[PDB]
Amino acid sequence: EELFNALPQPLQQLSLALAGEIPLTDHIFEQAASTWHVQPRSLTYKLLDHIPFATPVVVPPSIYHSLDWSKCFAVNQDRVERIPTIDNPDDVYVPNSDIGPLLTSLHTIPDYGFLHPTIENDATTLRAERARCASTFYKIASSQARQVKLDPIRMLGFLLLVQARPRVPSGLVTDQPTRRDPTLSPALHAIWQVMQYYKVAGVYYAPALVVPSGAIWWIPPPGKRNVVSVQYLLTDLISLAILAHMTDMSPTLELTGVLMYLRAASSHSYAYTLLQMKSVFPALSLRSMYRNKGFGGKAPAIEWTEPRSKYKFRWTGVTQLHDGLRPRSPSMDVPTLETLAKYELVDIGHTIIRERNAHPQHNHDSVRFVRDVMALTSGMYLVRQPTMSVLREYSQVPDIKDPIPPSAWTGPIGNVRYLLPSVQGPARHLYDTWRAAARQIAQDPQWHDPLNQAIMRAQYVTARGGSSASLKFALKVTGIVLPEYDDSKVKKSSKIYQAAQIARIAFMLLIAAIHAEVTMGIRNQVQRRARSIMPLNVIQQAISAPHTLVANYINKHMNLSTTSGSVVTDKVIPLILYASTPPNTVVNVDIKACDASITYNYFLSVICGAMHEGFEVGNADAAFMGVPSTIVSDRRSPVAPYSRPISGLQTMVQHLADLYAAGFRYSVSDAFSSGNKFSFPTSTFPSGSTATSTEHTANNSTMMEYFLNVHAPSHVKSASLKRILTDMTIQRNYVCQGDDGILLLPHEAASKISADDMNELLTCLRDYGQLFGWNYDIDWSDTAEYLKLYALMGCRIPNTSRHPPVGKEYAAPQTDEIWPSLIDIVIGHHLNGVTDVLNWREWLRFSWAFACYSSRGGYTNPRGQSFSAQYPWWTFVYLGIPPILLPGQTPFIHSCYMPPGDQGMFSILNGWRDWLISHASTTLPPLRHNHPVWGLSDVPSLLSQFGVYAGYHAAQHYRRPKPAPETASSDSINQITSDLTEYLFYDSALKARVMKGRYNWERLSSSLSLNVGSRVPSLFDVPGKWVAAGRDAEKPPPSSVEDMFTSLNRCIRRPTHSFSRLLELYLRVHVALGESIPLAIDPDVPQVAGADPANDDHWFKYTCLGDIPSATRNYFGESLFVGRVVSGLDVEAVDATLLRLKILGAPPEAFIAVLNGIGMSDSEAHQIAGRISLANAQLVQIARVVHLSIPSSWMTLNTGPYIHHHAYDFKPGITQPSAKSRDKSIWMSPILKLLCTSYAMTVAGPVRTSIVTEIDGSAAALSGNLRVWMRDV
């Protein structure tokens, strides 16, 4: 095309690669990456002008008609700068005004400009109503432009680079030339129509150019203005132009989306208008599909596994659809078109409904219509003021329609009161569930165990990054010397700086004076560069310890989360698919603002009274975690008040009632508004704290249980619905996690329920939360939504708008990163386009374009003015992205489900190996010696020519600057580390375990004589793990970055042209693929939306394997052989330590030395070591000792039976008998079967039966050589 002609010649040379015409050598990857950086970014929009094209979209000139920002911002109490709401009381986001007068010119680039420094100077010195008002708007408006990964200026550049040349047709017959043209896309046309305003000489100035410090805005010419809505409009169009070519969207559906963004840019406060229509497109398609007459298709017949608490699921065939299976629920059409009439977008509604009625049945084409319209929702991360993010949404107090009377409480027992039995509303079932769950902890002897107490203190440090240092406030009652620890360079956050100083002072001399106003929010100073964040003090989390534990007991028997890395893809996804099936219709119960719905006015007074009566069981004279027993003042009896001894477990509830009733002191110290700073209480829990938000899960199942059994079977007026509500049970019909959860209807009258009966149910359920202030976000759209994931007739609907192609959440005004951390954002950006299925070739074409810009880095040092790096092309191959073309074969045969690592590099060097031996037997001299896996052909010289070894070591090399102070100098290192060691080692019994562990292991390191100085995860790695997890967020010095930078170029250019000693041993194994395995599902049934036969690669994998993970003998390791660890030690690193020693034939003292290292008792270390075995272990868990693992891209598949009994260690008629793993097939076959699947999932097309053909050595030679490797590790 003429678009390809307009590209630069090195940039043309990479579009030939992305099309698949030529292999992508490293020289094309270097020159074109250098072409991106030296190019002015404004030249990218000139390339959009080089396409002559037309489509019916007109960008109005009414976008540029702006408001005045100073009319939109003012000052209120405590001298805070904020946005007064103009129209509606949630008008809080960025107003669309000119950034023009607020910016000065920039010294380096005269065309752009940052903030005028007179406004920057005085607003930190003198708090004005103009300058402080200006810097609030500027830093917020720059932040919403900063919400991208890199510039959308370049993200449009990769998309035009992919669309320059069409992809070449591979020999796989399921590919198609794409139906989409760039000429027909109104997304690209609206960007060109906007950019006609932004040129003065045909140069196309971008309105912003987001430097990694922050966005820098374009200066306006005289007569024209630069409003802030355009850069946000451009980002949303580029976010839509990328996805629509990846979702293969119709051009009549982009225009449906584009006209909403142009309407919101025409309106004022663009992000607020875009927020009010955040649920239009799912309501027009996903929430309402099949309400018409003609309905049919095929649906999965998923059955609940009849032991109900197991939460297991099995795909048990197909279900042909009919008009009794279409949703009885009313359509969401009438409430949605009224919302579109508020913004004059009623033609957007009638466009979808005309196209939705073209899909009467449930097919592959129908679910693609759902995800195409769900791609039209903007996934733009809205940023308001972090002051105003808390001043409104963390300020809403609930409305209790039925408050508890004061006569319903007993006399006080210290601070707390008990609930009288005379009141029997839903508060009683709240009071009686939290009481009996509190009884099962004073009985439970899991505590007063030194390892269990060490896990809980590890749980507060590791899980969240912490907020403040209120021990500077907690010197008010106890004289502390207060070490500032500037002689240790460590960050002063709540992770390390608090808990190390806690090891000196006991809790009882501290818990009486914990109540602080700068409890949380900012690092012990009222102005910094950080945002006000959620977690609180570690000793006020320690006084909140029983409230976590009683909430854990409620969620134990109901919510078997099992604390696994695969719990969304094992439990949530099949429940999503078991819901929305034509047998059962569901009510996806959501509880909005649940964190701001738990107060001491109703909830926290009941549970603290329930825990205190619940902890009355057991010993009243018993300490707990260092809090002793104490005297309470009983006032229940009016005639006999007295002093009672209460336990330490009841002592914590006395201080917790004082802390919950005073509230939670959020202190806002954001760096966005110029110096607004105030701490204030709230009744709002922290949001992301999973150890605290499990209390919301503890109330979600509990309050639904009183609804389904007592409240609604008595309150509802429908006599027919009382028959349904009789046998509903939350152990069968309700699943919760967090605030949201699925309600299930009983299988007898599930799909045959009247919608008039369901509307009377949900009216009573919405009125049921009015007794608590719980605003239920009930939906009745006959679709599933458990944790922000969707379904339609048992087809998973990947929300493409949830993971944006351009967007990225930044809670900081800066990115706070050195350059090569962008590469780890690339791989996460790639796999989100693989999980949420897209056009897998075009997404892989887009990924190599997007990764090519992330290959060069330039550092600015005042000492050294020049730094330039270059990762090779093969770096991204090791990290997970499959290559589009190898030299010597056809393109787009490597699947996106390829593993990363050595496991992925094995897969490419297997099918491409036959070319590598033949192409190196010619054109290269043979080896002087002999090589085991390639013979006399000089393949590792040829692999050195393509830079295979270059990108291999460049990917394995680290990409984050290590800190500069070490222990070899005269630095005082162990000031804060050894005090944190004293925090973890409180009891002398647990210290006697770990000193026994390292003494026995270092005795058995040399006596057993296999390793020396090898890393074994002891508990002394955990202060090394914690303190190094504090300096990773600290900005590194330029001495550390350049040392990290120079180590990159030394790692790339070094002559080590060998792989690791596992991949050198993997390449002996030659696997080969026979016919395709017989089918798991019927491919007429859509498993995941987007996996049609057009998107062929994702279509076979969900058809050959299936998306319901079959719980087998293996079940991909939900068990991890150590049920509880100190948080900081990876159990992945523990099973890869014990099972090696089981293979190596270690004495049982070697196991006990490892288990005493992690803190297990001597009674426990024997009892784990005999329990672990090589046969009782699982086939995935055996392969993890050789660093082979299931990738994240396989987690949504049913890899269970395929690794079990389709992958061959030994297919007896086909293979050669040199690969007989005799007496080693207990542990070599999990390696051999998983290397079979490592290559089966790499080849495109259907999943073939994989067979080990031969090993170049013996299989005994490989079992010997991995045994040499397992001794070295």
Binding site: F1210, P1212, G1213, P1217, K1220, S1221, R1222, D1223, S1225
Partner: protein, 49 residues
Amino acid sequence: VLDPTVLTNAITTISESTTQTISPISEILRLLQPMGNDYAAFWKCIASW
């Protein structure tokens, strides 16, 4: 029509412990790996009659 996999499929499903040094399943397939490189030798026996 000769389809030599049927003799292979009848042999390759005979069970054997792999712990032995000799696999008699291996040695009879070793005697039949090139398969004589042809199958006209059967018909040359018949045409010689």
